[PDB]
Amino acid sequence: GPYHFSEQVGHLLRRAYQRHVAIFQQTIPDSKLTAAQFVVLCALRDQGACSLVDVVKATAIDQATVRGVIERLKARKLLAVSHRRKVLVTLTPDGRALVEEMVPFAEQITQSTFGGLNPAERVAIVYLLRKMSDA
Amino acid sequence: GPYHFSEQVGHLLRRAYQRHVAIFQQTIPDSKLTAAQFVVLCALRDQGACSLVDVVKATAIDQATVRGVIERLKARKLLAVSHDPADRRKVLVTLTPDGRALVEEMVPFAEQITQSTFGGLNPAERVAIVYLLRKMSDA
């Protein structure tokens, strides 16, 4: 009859996300990188120099988090920032090196994330998530 | 093809979960209440007295997020803290009557949120994704 939160799609997205992030933490050597940091670095590797809303657009991460992430990555010298109200952001060579070094592990993470799902299941979930985030 | 972070299943989960939380925030009347807060409250409604790990188990929300939720809900007097009758040392959280009312008040909206989140998925697609997400989250 009533509400069961555990069987609701919204909750089941959180678990699946959360599970993905935990897998990412186990799999990435020595908490070198958070998942958000990795995503921002990838966006920069693929796209090139970006504004802040470029990075938000690219990564689907809220602006306040991205600002934080860029600051931490600036500190670690993995990216560069430059002006005069608007800023650019660009990979440093260590930046790109770290990304390249982690991309073999990120592949691992994907398989793990898909879990028990069989190949038809894998296609189906990706189809459904695409169809969900789009519309 | 090479690795693009955006095509991969981790990102689509991220995007779809962002969409859900935006939907949650837009439609929930009580603007102080977070998706995590709400879920914890539903778990106490369904389970009665719970330890911190009970809530982590019931919800699969991480322990840091849970303590934070509990602390926030303690402040608004929506849950009470007691001692475990088994262990005078170990602590229990329990809905207050106010907590129970608010859960009941939000149920319609939660249901709407679910509907919005499914968006334009057809009745079979709604079943398929709930199933695949559970299968994914097990093992």
Author numbering:
A (entry chain B): 13 to 95, 100 to 151
B (entry chain A): 13 to 151
Reproduce passages from the article.
BpsR is a member of the MarR family of bacterial transcriptional regulators. MarR proteins often repress genes involved in the response to organic compounds, environmental stresses, and virulence factors. They are obligate homodimers and many are responsive to ligand binding. Recently, we and others have shown that BpsR controls the growth of B. bronchiseptica by repressing genes involved in nicotinic acid (NA) degradation. BpsR repression is relieved by binding of 6-hydroxynicotinic acid (6HNA), allowing tight regulation of the pathway to control NA metabolism according to the needs and environment of the bacterium.
BpsR crystallized the in the primitive orthorhombic space group (P212121) with 2 dimers in the asymmetric unit. The secondary structure of the protein is primarily α-helical composed of 6 α-helices and 2 β-strands per monomer. BpsR contains a winged Helix-turn-Helix (wHtH) domain for DNA binding. In the dimer, the two wHtH motifs are positioned in tandem to one another to create a DNA binding surface. The overall structure of the dimer is similar to other members of the MarR family of transcriptional regulators. The RMSD between BpsR and ecMarR is 1.38 Å (over 129 Cα atoms) which is indicative of high structural similarity. The model suggests that helix α4, from the HTH domain, inserts into DNA major groove and likely functions in DNA sequence recognition. The β hairpin wing motif extents away from the protein, along the DNA helix, to provide interactions with the phosphodiester backbone and the minor groove. Although the DNA sequence for BpsR binding is likely different, residues Thr76, Arg79, Gln83, Arg84, Lys86 within helix α4 extend towards the DNA bases within the major groove, providing potential sequence specific interactions. Within the wing region, Arg100, Arg101, and Lys102 interact with the DNA phosphate groups in the minor groove also contributing to the stability of the recognition helix interactions within the major groove.
